[PDB]
Design a protein around this ligand. Structure first.
Ligand code: HEM
Ligand SMILES: CC[C@@H]1C[C@@H]2C[C@@H]3[C@H]4C/C=C\C(=O)NCC[C@H](O)[C@@H]5NC(=O)/C(=C(O)/C=C/[C@@H]4CC(=O)[C@H]3[C@@H]2[C@H]1C)C5=O
Length: 391
């Protein structure tokens, strides 16, 4: 009878069971659905799972995917492939997410952030930072980049939520797939009759003109980016803001030393356990040793990035949020092939958010007692339903 995973925790709590597991050999756990799997929790082990070619993201041996969602996570996009096939598909998007291209979006990200905060401030204190900023701004950034109009943003929230909900059935996934395919089918036909200088338009040229990808691959890449690209940052804006507002000095360290905002963002990326459970298991493609256990060909191992980010040998006093830490590189954006393609855009968003909040609301504080905060309970991610803030 195996340890159950995910573990018990509420909000952004890091559960004490990890402190036990760091002093144990690799541990096998049973999941809500699918096969059992080992839990990689040491920094080095999580790095290995995510970047060593002996770990495949594909269950090519009949495995039942260890998971928290009733419907297995399957499709034709970036999370369904190993290199080189993954690398060839990702290369279609690559150039648009390099630091050199994303750094160009800083001014636009701040424009949208400013518009969000004008409306927040016009709504009056105390106001919900989730509804006024965390949700709208990242949604607008990627929906604009892709070429989706503001009228339709709500459609992509719903499609993204059913992906991320652990009570989503395979039937719900079918409904989502059909609705989404219809919508992007419309978008494709629009761009075939009238090309556009946006990212979906780039994908349509890549399918039609260059023949680099197939239609289903074009849809898959768009679906990956519109599922992953704004609910993520949405959750993290509120998580980061809540983390800061819960300390005695709140925003003041960053008001006083704006130049430290990039380091703060990285420490928060390390510290915040953003995942309720985990992402994708990997499967060993040959016998190998990990934290005292022989992982056999075919067996699943889950990379627990949150645990890696509190590895007691990599990070002294790991539970402490120390905005000056500059610890060794966290795994909050993953590692290896599937390292977050949006990593620099998320850094830009989160940095700009802290710039805008410190500059405009230096005395930002919780608008309700902290004990009343409404943390989510059944989402793939940890976060807040609401974040009332006062100034
Ligand atoms: C704070 C915000 C974000 C966090 C914490 C985050 C985290 C991650 C992590 C850890 C992975 C790797 C998971 C694994 O290997 O199992 C990943 C993958 C991915 N992320 Fe991000 N992400 C964020 C924002 C974004 C944004 C802004 C985008 C795009 C606009 C994005 C798009 C993607 C995509 C497409 C993948 C799959 C990449 C691949 O398999 O090649 N994410 N994300
Ligand atoms: C902030 C935390 C970041 C946020 C990103 C978003 C990532 C999720 C969404 C990513 C891609 C996606 O939804 N693409 C279209 C569907 C696909 O065809 C396919 N079908 C499926 O069902 C399946 C998923 O459920 C996929 C779920 C992904 C799980 C995961 O690791 C998340 C990441 C986290 C680590 C697929 O990938």
């Amino acid at each position: 009878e195996l340890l159950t995973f995910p573990f018990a925790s509420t909000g952004l709590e890091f559960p004490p069971v990890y402190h036990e597991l760091y002093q144990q050999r690799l541990t096998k756990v049973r999941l809500p659905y699918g096969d059992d799997a080992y839990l990689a929790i040491r920094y080095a082990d999580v790095k290995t799972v995510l970047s060593d070619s002996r770990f495949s993201i594909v269950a090519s041996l009949g495995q039942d995917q260890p998971r928290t969602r009733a419907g297995a996570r399957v499709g034709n996009g970036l999370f369904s492939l190993d290199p080189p096939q993954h690398s060839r598909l990702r290369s279609v998007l690559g150039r648009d997410f390099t630091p050199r291209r994303v750094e160009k979006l800083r001014e636009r990200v701040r424009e949208l952030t400013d518009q969000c905060l004008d409306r927040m401030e016009a709504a009056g204190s105390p106001a919900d930072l989730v509804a006024h900023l965390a949700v709208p701004m990242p949604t607008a950034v990627v929906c604009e980049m892709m070429g989706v109009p503001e009228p339709d943003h709500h459609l992509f929230w719903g499609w993204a939520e059913t992906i991320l909900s652990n009570d989503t059935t395979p039937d719900d996934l079918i409904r989502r797939y059909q609705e989404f395919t219809a919508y992007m089918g419309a978008m494709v036909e629009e761009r075939r009759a009238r090309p556009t200088d946006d990212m979906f338009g780039m994908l349509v040229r890549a399918c039609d003109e260059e023949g680099r990808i197939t239609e289903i691959e074009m849809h898959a890449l768009a679906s990956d980016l519109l599922s992953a690209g704004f609910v993520s940052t949405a959750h993290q804006i509120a998580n980061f803001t809540a983390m800061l507002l819960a300390r005695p000095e709140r925003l003041q360290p960053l008001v006083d030393k704006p130049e430290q905002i990039p380091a703060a963002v990285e420490e928060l990326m390390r510290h915040v356990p953003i995942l309720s459970g985990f992402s994708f298991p990997r499967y060993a493609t040959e016998d190998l040793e990990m934290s005292g256990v022989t992982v056999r060909r075919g067996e699943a191992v889950i990379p627990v990035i949150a645990a890696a980010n509190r590895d007691p040998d990599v990070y002294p006093d790991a539970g402490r949020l120390d905005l000056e830490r500059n610890g060794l590189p966290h795994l909050g954006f993953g590692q290896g092939p599937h390292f977050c393609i949006g990593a620099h855009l998320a850094r830009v968003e989160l940095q700009v958010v802290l710039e805008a909040l410190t500059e405009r609301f230096p005395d930002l504080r919780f608008g309700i007692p902290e004990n009343a905060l409404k943390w989510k309970r059944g989402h793939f991610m940890n976060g807040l339903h609401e974040l009332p803030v006062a100034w």
